[PDB]
Structure formats: structure tokens, C-alpha cells
Design a protein around this ligand. Structure first.
Ligand SMILES: COc1cc(-c2nn(CCN3CCC(N(C)C)CC3)c3ncnc(N)c23)ccc1NC(=O)OC(C)(C)C
Length: 274
């Protein structure tokens, strides 16, 4: 069951979906039979051994709301092979043609699905380290899956990529002191909730990374997004407690969001955008 390293010749890279900071994502075909996504890593951006050791852990994480790792090509340039998610990143989906039609019920259901995957990560005593809408994938029927879990711990710049960090999504104890835990992921999830309720806008509008760190450190928190109910902003603010142990669990977040329109905001009615 550990024989998941594959020869590069077993993959056809057929359609380039986009370019990231560290490589490319392709739609392709594996073993002549299977539709896959292929994520490529420029040489020198990740230690092959360290990747394989982490991949052994990641291959064990199996949940309907986590993207499934199928295979790796372990020679530089490293290729990661996963299931194909037909609507791409949640961030692109929110910002695309469909995004303008999403209302609060769809966005809260998407949040509940992300919370369910993260509750699994929580049960497995694992840590994502880079939770944000860019690292959620969307399929048919608004299925959302958590992607890119664990990788941030291993990613480095090469000479090229160095000429180009998600501070705005990162809990202060993680950004400042390297204290990455499930509770720093909960902070990230709170920021992700702002991405959902603004249909993809960058957090802390008008602020650069240094201003965000300065302001958050002195107690600043984002205010309630336009048309967002106060009750959902209150949940965001629980995720952004200074004391990490006082932030909610993903188990709690999942339950709150699943039950939201019955228990919390039954008075919901559609407005201009939500
Ligand atoms: C094949 O490996 C992955 C693929 C994807 C993925 N990313 N994307 C979106 C590509 N998108 C990035 C945004 C860009 N815009 C900014 C212009 C346009 C292109 C996918 N789309 C459909 N299926 C996928 N599977 C992926 C996301 C993550 C991974 N890898 C991964 O999660 O690795 C582990 C499972 C090991 C954590």
C-alpha cells in the first residue's frame, strides 16, 4: 500500500490549469485510464526525501472533504497526483462567473464542508498550516475539499521564485513564533469565512502585510463584512481570540455551520449579494 511512487512516463500532462509561485497545475491522465490533477514543483523548492516522509503521513489522511493523494513522482521536478476537482480553487470559483450567484446558504454550506475536513485533520492530530480559499477545491454540486495540507512546512524558494507568505491568514503566534497548531488553523478558518462572505476578497482591505501584523498585534480584528449577519461575524471573532486554547474546535465550527439557518439565523432573508 506504500507503492505509490510512479514513473513520470505514467502521466500525460494534457491541459495547463494555471501557474503558482512554485510550479504548475495540470489536468492529465494517469496509466492511460484515470483523470487526475498534476501539481509540479520547481527543482530546489522541496526536499524529495522530506516530501516522501511527509507523503507517508498524508497518504493515511482519508476523508470525503480532503483531496486524495493518488501518487507522486519523487525525482525533481516532483509531481504530486491527486483527484481532479472540476471547478478548481474555491478562491477562483468565488471570483468567477458562478460566484456572483452564491448566497449565504451556499457559502455557509461550503464553510461547513471545509470545517468537516478540518475536523478530520483535528481528530488525526494533524495541522494544515496554510488554510485559505486558494487551498480549497470545488467539484460538482458545490463539493469542497481541503488541499495542500502539510506542504507549507517543506516549501522553500529557489533563485527564480525568490524574485517574487500568507501573513493575512496566519495566527499571530504562528506568524511571529512559528507556533503552528490546529488552533492556528482555526484562526485561518476565521479569515477563510471572510473570503466566503465577500465572495473572494483579500482580507484586511487596503492594508499591506506589515500593517496587518502591526494592527492585529494591538487587537485589531476585521469588522462584519457587508450584508454578513452579526452572528456569523461573532463566529469569525471566536476564531480570532488571542489565546489559542480559547478558539473553537473544528468539531464545534462544523456543527454551528451545519445548523446555522435553523439554530442561529432563522430570520435570514436574501439581500443584494448574500
Ligand atoms: C495534484 O495536486 C494538487 C492539485 C490541486 C489543484 N489545484 N487546482 C487549481 C489550479 N488553479 C490554481 C489557481 C489558478 N488561478 C489563480 C489562476 C488557476 C489554477 C486544481 N484544480 C483541479 N483539481 C485539482 N486537484 C487542483 C491542489 C492541490 C494539490 N496537491 C495537494 O493537495 O497535495 C497533497 C494531497 C499532497 C497535500
Amino acid at each position: 500500500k506504500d507503492a505509490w511512487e510512479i514513473p513520470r512516463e505514467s502521466l500525460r500532462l494534457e491541459v495547463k490549469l494555471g501557474q503558482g509561485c512554485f510550479g504548475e497545475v495540470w489536468m492529465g491522465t494517469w496509466n492511460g485510464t484515470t483523470r487526475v490533477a498534476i501539481k509540479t514543483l520547481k527543482p530546489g523548492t522541496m526536499s524529495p526525501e522530506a516530501f516522501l516522509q511527509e507523503a507517508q503521513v498524508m497518504k493515511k489522511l482519508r476523508h470525503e472533504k480532503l483531496v486524495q493523494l493518488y501518487a507522486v513522482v519523487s525525482e525533481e521536478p516532483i509531481y504530486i497526483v491527486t483527484e481532479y476537482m472540476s471547478k478548481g480553487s474555491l478562491l477562483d470559483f468565488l471570483k468567477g462567473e458562478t460566484g456572483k450567484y452564491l448566497r449565504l446558504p451556499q457559502l455557509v454550506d461550503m464553510a461547513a464542508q471545509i470545517a468537516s475536513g478540518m475536523a478530520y485533520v483535528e481528530r488525526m492530530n494533524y495541522v494544515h498550516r496554510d488554510l485559505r480559499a486558494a487551498n480549497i477545491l470545488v467539484g460538482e454540486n458545490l463539493v469542497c475539499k481541503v488541499a495542500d495540507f502539510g506542504l507549507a512546512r517543506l516549501i522553500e524558494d529557489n533563485e527564480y521564485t525568490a524574485r517574487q507568505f500568507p501573513i493575512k491568514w496566519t495566527a499571530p503566534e504562528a506568524a511571529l513564533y512559528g507556533r503552528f497548531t490546529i488552533k492556528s488553523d482555526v484562526w485561518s478558518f476565521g479569515i477563510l469565512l471572510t473570503e466566503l462572505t465577500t465572495k473572494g476578497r483579500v482580507p484586511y482591505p487596503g492594508m499591506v502585510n506589515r500593517e496587518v501584523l502591526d494592527q492585529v498585534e494591538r487587537g485589531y480584528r476585521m469588522p462584519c463584512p457587508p450584508e454578513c449577519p452579526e452572528s456569523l461575524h461573532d463566529l469569525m471573532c471566536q476564531c480570532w481570540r488571542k489565546e489559542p486554547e480559547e478558539r473553537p474546535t473544528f468539531e464545534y465550527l462544523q456543527a454551528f455551520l451545519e445548523d446555522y439557518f435553523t439554530s442561529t439565523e432563522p430570520q435570514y432573508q436574501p439581500g443584494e449579494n448574500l
